[PDB]
């Protein structure tokens, strides 16, 4: 089920930029003299390639946020410069250019009968110069300065890194190479020019191990499923029927239910997986099954207390103590109330007198994990007395004492049955020692292959595990060792690192988007959509379950983390030049100025006679955004009624009128009555005056040579002039480099001889010869 | 450049690889194969027999594991053999203005096989402590099997040397020595077959 | 005269290669290696004539 969902994760795709991200493109426009006639020679200026910006300053900021999101989603990881190259037909040195549209622009400029020859010769002089000895090439490009800055920033922060065989040799986690039982081998070389991508290896910053138990439990369940998939199976189990009949002979009957190989395999896999992923487990057993109790006692001897729910631990301890321990020495049986902070084993330690049993109980009481930081990854390691398996002897001696006391206040048959059980468990001491050492080594080796922080916090969903399987495992283990297969281990490691990298990448994307949204003074956006996108893109949840409240709490938690450097600088660049991008649009204006005083108009070499106010000084500034937001109209109405100067700043669509009849007959101020009458400024449409020779009405301004005078001006800035000698640039890049992904497929490992396996202390793992 | 392919469960493969490493200079392979083979051989035969801890090692050290083996074992025969393999490299000579890489004289006449046989026979009667019964018996009997072919191994190795000399004589273009991208798969089982 | 075409013909006329797979940066390195070698006297004298 979920195994496919958590195993079908591929590394995040590195986009290959097919063309430079363009916002500005050249456009050829006519011009007029200061008098207002055509010049019969056109000039090329800058215009936005896209003109989908809607009116309203809030919608402007929304469009800016969408633009930032598009730029960050289309980020180039490795930027090739040989692929994007079309040969220029006009370069008399047979050069090559960066983009097909650049070639079209070069052809247009090279062939225009109204253009001079210096620019044409500069066009023809373009040629790429390649210096392969230092792995650097130069290309020509024509862009608006914003686009050139963005392209340079993309170029100079690529994620590639030189690759060598020893680098991959060091890419494996250290606690695998350092051990002897695993050996690595290669079969191919690597060139000095190849490059690869490093994943992200930063720890948790959402604190999902605290106060977010739902998603944490979901992730733990997924990782537990994966671990169950990866942990190796058992080989060479003793025949079930022979073991059953041998135990039956040993017990002298005239119990054994639940002893099958599948049970042992499931118990082994479940125990290892739960230990690995910190998924707590709950037990269940019939209180009148002594052998189950002893097997559970062994299980508690090996595995520490912290990985068990208080209910199961309390029940197991109560059963063990009041069925064996106080029964031995004939002391009054304890009544451990369900809910005291003390544990039954602690009270037993404080009560009994004999040495070995008390020592063993004391060991099982306070045996906690140790937090150890290795190679930047936090891990949980058992006490060193458990890996070499000596503590089992400290168990058995105590059990041996249990066979010496007379068991007073009990019938003979009960003592006989308990002695039979303890003897059956005792005769298999070597099997238990080998199993415990194998478990320790397998846990250490496997757990050394995870790269995310782990915490010991009980979660909501609890694993079910019956003790009969544990009894079967303890009675059925044999001689053949089991070592995890290198192929499975590498597959598990690849999946884990892929998951971690995906998580970190999505975190950074969400943080960048939220930071930009909150710094652009956006406050009318339901922010649950971004969190929903993040959760969906993590590719393990369904947004149909987690409600909105946790999304908002996660957003508040996420705001604190400082954003990554590249995205922060991208946002800084896109915000520092916001005004130039916004004003240069030819679909919206920046406000309307009203003065009710005779003022002259401006003369520009792109609009002819246009009504434009470059600055807004000397007037009262009123925000249209606030005007729509609060719904008030008090100050503006009183200012306009008494015919006093006013200034409005905000986004407004414009209507172009090019009739001198409209100029003489004042109609540029009659679009303010609806503000009072309709009391809504959503569709305010100021009229843009424009006089030139194209309109066939310019003879009025020529015959009588009068200076046009109006009463309104529009807050619009004339677009900046275009010069070819300035947009030219020599982009820097790398000649050629093969990007490598899925790197670990180039290393193969061979299992050591299973007999000669060495775990941690220069000794063989299993020894039952 | 030759890559080494093996299945570590076949100890006879590593036993034959001992001869392979003795005959062919170690600079003809890629570093991955050399370090893998050295680590396996050292941690499956010799250090197992000499009661020493398994060689903790880190990939990428400037010194090969065989050097560490040379400066950690004081058994004269195997130590001398390990040193000889350690400093066995292609010899740079120029003949008639033509650059060539040729083997050392000692291996050319077929003499190192006697040293290998003596070292193997020394390992044969060794105590081999802290190892199970059947595994140790099989290991030492395979070692005896490879030792029991002394004359044939000498003839084979010196025939290889003579064939190499004769073929290399007519090479016109010089040959440099540098690692390359691709390699050729050498079958360890085939090496064992040729040896036996 | 695009030197890449000449290097392509030279590589293809070695009968042991395949031009359609070669990388461009290595081609440029090979070209720069070729630029600095002195030509044999016969061809230089033919060019002089």
């Amino acid at each position: 089920s979920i195994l496919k969902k958590l195993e079908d994760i591929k590394p995040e795709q590195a986009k290959a930029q097919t063309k430079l991200f363009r916002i500005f493109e050249p456009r050829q426009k006519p011009i007029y003299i200061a008098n207002g006639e055509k010049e019969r020679r056109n000039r090329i200026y800058w215009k936005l390639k896209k003109d989908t910006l809607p009116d309203g300053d809030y919608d402007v900021r929304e469009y800016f946020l969408n633009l930032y999101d598009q730029v960050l989603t289309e980020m180039p990881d490795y930027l090739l410069l040989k692929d994007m190259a079309v040969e220029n037909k006009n370069s008399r040195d047979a050069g090559k250019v960066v983009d097909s549209e650049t070639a079209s622009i070069c052809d247009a400029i090279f062939q225009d009968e109204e253009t001079e020859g210096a620019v044409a010769r500069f066009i023809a002089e373009m040629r790429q110069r390649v210096q392969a000895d230092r792995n650097v090439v130069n290309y020509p490009s024509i862009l608006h300065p914003i686009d050139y800055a963005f392209n340079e920033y993309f170029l100079q922060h690529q994620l590639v890194e030189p690759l060598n065989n020893d680098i991959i040799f060091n890419y494996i986690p250290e606690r695998i190479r350092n051990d002897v039982n695993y050996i690595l081998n290669m079969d191919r070389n690597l060139p000095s020019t190849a490059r690869y991508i490093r994943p992200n290896l930063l720890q948790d910053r959402l604190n999902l191990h605290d106060n977010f138990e739902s998603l944490w439990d979901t992730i733990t369940t997924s990782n537990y499923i994966l671990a169950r998939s990866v942990v190796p199976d058992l080989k060479e189990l003793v025949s079930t029927e022979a073991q059953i009949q041998k135990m039956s002979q040993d017990l002298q009957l005239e119990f054994l239910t639940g002893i099958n190989s599948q049970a042992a395999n499931d118990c082994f896999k479940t125990l290892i997986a739960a230990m690995l992923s910190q998924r707590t487990m709950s037990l269940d057993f019939v209180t009148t099954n002594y052998m189950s109790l002893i097997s559970g006692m062994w299980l508690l001897t090996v595995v520490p207390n912290d990985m068990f729910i208080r209910e199961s631990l309390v029940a197991c301890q109560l059963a063990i103590v009041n069925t064996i321990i106080y029964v031995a020495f004939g002391m009054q049986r304890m009544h451990y109330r369900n809910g005291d902070p003390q544990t039954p084993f602690q009270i037993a330690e404080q009560q009994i007198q004999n040495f070995q049993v008390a020592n063993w109980l004391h060991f099982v009481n306070n045996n906690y994990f140790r937090q150890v930081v290795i190679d930047g990854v936090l891990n949980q390691v058992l006490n060193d007395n458990i890996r070499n398996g000596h503590v089992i002897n400290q168990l058995m001696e105590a059990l041996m004492q249990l066979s010496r006391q007379q068991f007073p206040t009990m019938p003979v048959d009960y003592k006989r049955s308990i002695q039979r059980g303890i003897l059956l468990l005792s005769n298999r001491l070597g099997q238990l020692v080998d199993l415990t050492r194998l478990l320790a080594y397998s846990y250490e080796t496997l757990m050394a292959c995870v790269t995310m922080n782990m915490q010991h916090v009980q979660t909501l969903t609890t694993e079910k595990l019956q003790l009969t399987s544990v009894t079967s495992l303890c009675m059925l283990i044999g001689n053949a060792t089991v070592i995890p297969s290198p192929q499975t281990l590498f597959h598990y490691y690849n999946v884990n690192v892929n998951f971690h990298s995906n998580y970190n990448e999505r975190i950074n994307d969400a943080v960048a988007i939220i930071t930009a949204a909150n710094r652009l003074n956006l406050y009318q956006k339901k922010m649950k959509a971004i969190v929903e996108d993040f959760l969906k893109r993590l590719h393990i949840f369904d947004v149909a379950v987690a409600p909105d409240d946790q999304m908002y709490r996660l957003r508040d938690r996420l705001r604190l983390l400082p954003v990554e450097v590249r995205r922060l600088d991208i946002f800084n660049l896109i915000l520092m030049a916001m005004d130039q991008i916004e004003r240069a649009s030819d679909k919206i204006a920046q406000g309307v100025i009203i003065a009710y005083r005779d003022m002259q108009l401006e003369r520009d070499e792109m609009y002819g006679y246009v009504n434009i106010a470059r600055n807004l000084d000397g007037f009262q500034q009123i925000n249209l955004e606030e005007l729509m937001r609060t719904g008030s109209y008090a100050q503006i109405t009183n200012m306009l009624l008494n015919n006093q100067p006013v200034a409005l700043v905000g986004a407004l669509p414009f209507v172009t009128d090019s009739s001198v009849i409209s100029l003489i007959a004042i109609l540029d101020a009659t679009v303010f009555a609806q503000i009072v009458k309709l009391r809504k400024v959503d569709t305010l449409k100021p009229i843009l005056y424009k006089i030139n020779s194209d309109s066939n009405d310019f003879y009025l301004v020529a015959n009588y040579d009068w200076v046009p005078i109006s009463t309104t001006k529009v807050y619009k800035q004339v677009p900046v002039q275009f010069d070819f000698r300035n947009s030219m640039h020599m982009l820097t890049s790398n000649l050629t480099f093969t990007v490598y992904s899925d790197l670990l497929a180039f290393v193969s490992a061979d299992t050591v001889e299973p007999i000669n396996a060495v775990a941690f202390d220069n000794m063989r793992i299993m020894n039952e010869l | 450049t030759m890559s080494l392919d093996f299945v570590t469960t076949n100890y006879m493969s590593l036993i034959s690889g001992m001869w392979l490493l003795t005959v062919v200079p170690n600079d003809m392979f890629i570093r991955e194969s050399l370090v893998a083979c050295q680590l396996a051989i050292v941690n499956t035969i010799i250090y197992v027999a000499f009661g020493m801890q398994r060689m903790h090692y880190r990939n990428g050290d400037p010194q090969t594991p065989f050097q560490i083996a040379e400066q950690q074992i004081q058994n004269f025969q195997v130590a001398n053999w390990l040193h000889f393999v350690n400093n066995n490299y292609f010899r740079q000579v120029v003949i008639d203005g033509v650059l060539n890489q040729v083997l050392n004289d000692n291996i050319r006449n077929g003499h190192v096989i006697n040293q290998l046989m003596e070292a193997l026979m020394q390992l044969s009667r060794q105590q081999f402590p802290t190892m199970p019964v059947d595994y140790k018996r099989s290991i030492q009997r395979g070692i005896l099997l490879l030792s029991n072919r002394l004359g044939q191994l000498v003839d084979l190795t010196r025939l290889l040397a003579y064939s190499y000399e004769t073929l290399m004589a007519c090479v016109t273009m010089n040959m440099q020595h540098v690692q390359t991208l691709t390699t050729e798969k050498l079958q360890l089982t085939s090496v064992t077959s040729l040896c036996m | 005269k695009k030197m890449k075409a000449i290097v392509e013909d030279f590589l293809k006329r070695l009968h042991i290669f395949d031009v359609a797979v070669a990388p461009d940066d290595q081609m440029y390195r090979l070209r720069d290696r070729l630029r600095l070698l002195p030509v044999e006297v016969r061809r230089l004298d033919i060019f002089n004539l």
């Binding site: 192929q487 597959h491 093969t738 899925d742 497929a745 180039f746 | 991208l181 | 290669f17």
Partner: peptide, 20 residues
């Protein structure tokens, strides 16, 4: 293992597409 072999073939083919 078959998927692993397919992935390794893909990687080695990417490497081989730089050898004439």
């Amino acid at each position: 293992k078959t998927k692993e072999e397919h992935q390794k073939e893909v990687q080695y083919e990417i490497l081989q597409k730089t050898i004439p």
